Amino acid sequence: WIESTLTKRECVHACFTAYSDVKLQAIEEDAYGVRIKQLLGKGLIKAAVTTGAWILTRLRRELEKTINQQRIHARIGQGVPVVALIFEGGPNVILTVLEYLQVPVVVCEGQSEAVHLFQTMMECMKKKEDIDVAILTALLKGTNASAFDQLILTLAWDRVDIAKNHVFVYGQQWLVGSLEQAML
Numbered sequence: 001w002i003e004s005t006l007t008k009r010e011c012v013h014a015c016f017t018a019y020s021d022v023k024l025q026a027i028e029e030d031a032y033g034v035r036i037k038q039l040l041g042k043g044l045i046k047a048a049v050t051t052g053a054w055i056l057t058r059l060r061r062e063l064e065k066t067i068n069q070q071r072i073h074a075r076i077g078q079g080v081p082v083v084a085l086i087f088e089g090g091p092n093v094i095l096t097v098l099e100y101l102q103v104p105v106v107v108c109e110g111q112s113e114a115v116h117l118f119q120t121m122m123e124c125m126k127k128k129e130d131i132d133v134a135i136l137t138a139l140l141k142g143t144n145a146s147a148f149d150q151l152i153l154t155l156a157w158d159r160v161d162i163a164k165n166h167v168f169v170y171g172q173q174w175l176v177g178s179l180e181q182a183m184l
Contacts, residue, residue: 001089002026002057008041022102029102031055040087043132051157056092063109068094073156078149081140084118084126086111096156138166147172151182
């Protein structure tokens with residue numbers, strides 16, 4: 001969990017460590033903390049750098065998720081997508097956060113019995129375990145969302161490698177228009 005994700009990132013009223021406290025290891029405010037070791041360790045790093053995520057590592061936490069997901073991107077209708085990574089005990093990678101400086105959102109806010117909590121709220125796709133980079137972000141293309149929205153999620157990210165392999169699969173059945181709109 002928290003000790004494993006911090007060792008991954010290290011290997012690659014206000015307080016500052018050198019009641020909300022920033023840091024200056026889980027640098028709260030990236031990680032807003034509230035073989036297989038380096039694959040699950042170095043996989044979510046390449047999944048969190050290329051999208052600019054908030055790794056989370058309980059009521060304030062779930063309120064922060066259900067209010068973080070109701071946010072809007074720049075030109076995109078959808079909300080910030082939340083993934084539960086319960087492989088290491090519950091880290092919850094939020095895929096495209098708003099790069100905040102240290103918080104008004106937070107003002108406005110075993111584990112196998114916590115898997116089932118997520119699957120009754122909207123979706124909250126849970127990945128529990130191929131590369132951990134593309135599985136963690138490609139877990140969001142498994143709900144009932146439209147193929148166009150699966151493209152715009154990849155387009156808010158910088159990730160072409162998902163969009164070729166998992167959004168332009170043969171037999172995708174695109175709409176006759178609106179691929180023109182993602183072109184816009």
